[PDB]
């Protein structure tokens, strides 16, 4: 049977400069639209009606301060379809209501699905194991938990992260002040995975480069390698002795080493995703009850835990009125928490 | 401080007094460790994807490599053939030496910049200040996300070391 | 009537060390939250 | 300090049950030929 399906399959899988595949029918439009929406929004679109903020190059913002901002809190979790009941097909209103945000987030989610399908698709054609796709589940868990589950637990998309450099910094600081997210052991594990991943990347790269075999005569050692050679290009035996004597332990199985390098950052990101699922419901690691009971009763008891809560209280009271304009917070000067003099 | 919550205290106060999040050396540092962790999983997944079959399904594939063996344990050509098609051919390494050099250099250079950010904000050359940078025709301040960061930074500043300042400027 | 699907199980010494380190470190991390 | 007193047995079983699992598997591996 060589029908139209099989002929289409032939054309989609041609060896061209940019492989396409069946997965490319999903991947390429959704990735292109999400990227084009971000560039369109950061260049031309305001956040004045949703946030009270300028947020585009048109308005005078720079690369650090432009964003595609979340919709107004009053939209709830509306899909904000262009043809939906809020914008009613009006492209200009849609932009002013925050429609580009769900546009980017949703085309982005389906784009990410498409990229992972592409990793599966290409791996099956070339004949390799699909561990690259498996490792990409960690970026997907992060994106889904932070940009979708988290606002879906909250009151509206408004509290999702906005797509911009400084807008994401605000998201970090909001999470410290309101959620005490540095205290959360699921974030801690994520930090370990990311910093441990960066560590493993540096140390393995440096170990290889400094246990190379002399396989050429030039002082530039890059040339003395051939993709199809059978031999290892560096000494696993010398690398093992070096670390065993510097650090006490060393890798001795090269297959374990590279599996571990997949495992560490991927597990870290997955752990951080779980904690953000908790924050969707405000299920925080905010306090240690034992510390608060002691400190309530003993005004000489002070730890770095209680010091950081005072900082969180400053963050909340000083940023909330501007950061949550729909709440209409009016905090007279006399209620604002402040230390002496400052 | 030499502690876990003490570390967090240090970071929060650092943000209030230097706006480290808006400093490009901290931003290069983030690229360093985010990039390093990305390339870590990247390298690990590609090498693991192209391990040469040396074992049965009831045993760990790790027994297919023997410490000190002369021959490589995975097919870098098959890995390059996969990753080259994932992006495009010339975005993929086929030289193991320059690949591993890139793995070394990217997080190391990024962390150098992170260290230099702390070291130069030590002398109070602080992150970008765009507070009230956008002004309308009459002269009203138009807030940006930078101004929202400033509100958060002010809350950190007015509360930190709440009993330690007698005069209005926290100059150190 | 011996079942033909049985298979021996292994855990080598390095895996034991790795596993014990993970469990002790996880306990060291989570214990404070258990005591609260 | 008024800690949760179940924290003690929670931590102890958290260490012991999985550690014991690993020790059983390891020891019966050494005893094979």
């Amino acid at each position: 049977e060589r029908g139209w399906f099989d002929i289409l399959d032939d054309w989609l899988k041609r060896d061209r400069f940019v492989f396409v595949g069946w997965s490319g029918i999903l991947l390429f439009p959704c990735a292109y639209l999400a990227l084009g929406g971000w560039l369109t929004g950061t260049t031309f679109v305001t956040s004045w009606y949703t946030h009270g903020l300028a947020s585009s190059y048109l308005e005078g913002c720079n690369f650090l301060t432009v964003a595609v901002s979340t919709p107004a809190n009053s939209m709830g979790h509306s899909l904000l379809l262009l043809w939906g009941p809020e914008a009613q097909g009006d492209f200009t209103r849609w932009c002013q209501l925050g429609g580009l945000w769900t546009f980017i987030a949703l085309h982005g989610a389906f784009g990410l699905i498409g990229f992972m399908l592409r990793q599966f698709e290409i791996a099956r054609l070339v004949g390799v194991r699909p561990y690259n796709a498996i490792a990409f589940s960690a970026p997907i868990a992060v994106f889904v938990s932070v940009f979708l589950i988290y606002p879906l637990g909250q009151s509206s998309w408004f509290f999702a992260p906005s797509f911009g450099v400084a807008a994401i910094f605000r998201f970090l600081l909001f999470f410290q002040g309101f959620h005490n997210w540095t205290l959360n052991p699921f974030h801690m594990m994520g930090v370990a995975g990311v910093l441990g991943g960066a560590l493993l990347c540096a140390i393995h790269g440096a170990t290889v480069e400094n246990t190379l075999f002399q396989d050429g005569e030039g002082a530039s050692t890059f040339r003395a390698f051939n993709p199809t050679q059978a031999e290892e290009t560096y000494s696993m035996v010398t690398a093992n002795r070096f670390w065993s004597q510097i650090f006490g332990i060393a890798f001795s199985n090269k297959r374990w080493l590279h599996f571990f390098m997949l495992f560490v950052p991927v597990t870290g990101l997955w752990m951080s995703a779980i904690g953000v699922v908790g924050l969707a419901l405000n299920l925080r690691s905010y306090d240690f009850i034992s510390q608060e009971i002691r400190a309530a009763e003993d005004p000489e008891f002070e730890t770095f835990y209680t010091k950081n809560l005072l900082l969180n209280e400053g963050i909340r009271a000083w940023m909330a009125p501007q950061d949550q304009p729909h709440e209409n917070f009016v905090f007279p000067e006399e209620v604002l928490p402040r230390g002496n003099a400052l | 401080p030499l502690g876990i919550s003490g570390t967090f205290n240090f970071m929060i106060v650092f943000q209030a007094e230097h706006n480290i999040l808006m400093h490009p050396f901290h931003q290069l540092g983030v690229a360093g460790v985010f990039g390093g962790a990305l390339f870590c999983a990247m390298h690990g997944s590609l090498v693991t994807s192209s391990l040469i079959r040396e074992t049965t399904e009831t045993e760990s594939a790790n027994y297919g490599y023997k410490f000190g063996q002369e021959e490589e344990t995975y097919n870098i050509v098959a890995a390059h053939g996969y990753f080259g098609r994932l992006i495009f051919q010339y975005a993929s390494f086929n030289n193991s030496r320059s690949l591993h050099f890139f793995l070394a250099a990217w997080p190391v250079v990024g962390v150098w910049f992170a260290a230099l950010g702390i070291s130069t904000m030590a002398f109070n050359l602080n992150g970008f200040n765009f507070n009230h940078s956008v002004i309308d025709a009459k002269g009203n301040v138009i807030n940006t996300w930078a101004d929202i960061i400033n509100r958060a930074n002010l809350g950190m500043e007015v509360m930190h070391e709440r009993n330690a300042h007698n005069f209005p400027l926290d100059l150190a | 009537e011996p079942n033909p699907n049985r298979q021996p199980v292994e855990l080598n010494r390095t895996s034991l060390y790795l596993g014990l380190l993970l469990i002790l470190v996880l306990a060291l991390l989570f214990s404070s939250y258990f005591f609260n | 300090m008024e800690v949760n007193q179940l924290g003690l047995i929670a931590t102890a079983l958290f260490v012991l049950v999985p550690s014991v699992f690993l020790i059983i598997l390891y020891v019966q591996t050494e005893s094979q030929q």
Partner: peptide
Amino acid sequence: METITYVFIFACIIALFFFAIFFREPPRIT
């Protein structure tokens, strides 16, 4: 009770370091 628990766990880890370094499986070349 909680102090004893934290120090006990910490002490086990330092013990584990000792055995992992000095009573490791030796790497053997082939």
